[PDB]
């Protein structure tokens, strides 16, 4: 996260760290959606152009964290992966269209003050909240700058951007499964996700029922916090039918 601030304790209890066993390192963010399921970006697990193809055994998920590097004894829970599911139409060859993956945990994680799942939107929640101007919130332990790393979980609130503006900001083909967010240049405020934040959640607080819904997954950008550029997020509601299928079938 670039130009964000330190997260408060328990501010994002669905935030998950995707952790590589060896060499020990942060791979990506992710989010807790129930006691057995974690949502992330497909490209955090599978990206052939860079020889990335992780198996269950290569990875751990760390839940309930604040500090990036510290082992948070009595706070975080570390879970093993039972099975990875990648959207069958995830487009890694071109533009990361449908950048989404689910991970089933070997055992249910116990909820606590620091560990609690986020809601997934339904048709109605998406319709009312996913509007240009409406702000969402992105958290992660990714880079503080495009060109280092934070001591603790970072947070930034960013407005959803009009679709024509998203399209005109880039040469990449944008699809209905993506939305972009971020401030325009000279607005007086900045902020963006960055490398290492991917797979993390873009959440919004419903003013109807006071619940947090994950509307997006940090997906891609051309640099971090550049003027006239915006972060792109997997549109979670558009892919909810696949989410439900995987869960109903294998959960």
């Amino acid at each position: 996260i670039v130009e964000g601030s330190d997260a408060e304790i328990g501010m994002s209890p669905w935030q998950v760290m995707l952790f590589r066993k060896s060499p020990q390192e942060l791979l990506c963010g992710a989010s807790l959606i129930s006691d057995r399921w974690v949502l992330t970006a497909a490209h955090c697990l599978l990206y052939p152009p860079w020889d990335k193809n992780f198996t269950e055994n290569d990875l751990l998920v760390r839940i309930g964290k604040h500090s990036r590097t510290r082992y948070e004894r009595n706070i975080e829970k570390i879970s093993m992966l039972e099975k990875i599911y990648i959207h069958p139409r995830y487009n890694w060859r071109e533009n990361l269209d449908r950048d989404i993956a689910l991970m089933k945990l070997k055992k249910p994680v116990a909820f606590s003050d620091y560990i609690h799942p986020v809601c997934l939107p339904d048709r109605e929640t998406a319709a009312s909240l996913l509007q240009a101007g409406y702000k969402g919130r992105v958290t992660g332990w990714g880079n503080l700058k495009e060109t280092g790393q934070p001591s603790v979980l970072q947070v930034v609130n960013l407005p959803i951007v009009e679709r024509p503006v998203c399209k005109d900001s880039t040469r990449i083909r944008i699809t209905d499964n993506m939305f972009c967010a971020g401030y325009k240049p000279d607005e007086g405020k900045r902020g963006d996700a960055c490398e290492g934040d991917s797979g993390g959640p873009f959440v919004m607080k419903s003013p109807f029922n006071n619940r947090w819904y994950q509307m997006g997954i940090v997906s891609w950008g051309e640099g971090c916090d550049r003027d006239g550029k915006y972060g792109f997020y997997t549109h979670v509601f558009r892919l909810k039918k696949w989410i439900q299928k995987v869960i109903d079938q294998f959960g």
Binding site: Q24, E25, L26, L60, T69, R70, Y71, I78, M80
Partner: peptide, 10 residues
């Protein structure tokens, strides 16, 4: 950098 986690997890 990263603090060692309990061996049971690895």
């Amino acid at each position: 950098d990263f603090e060692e986690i309990p061996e049971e997890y690895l």
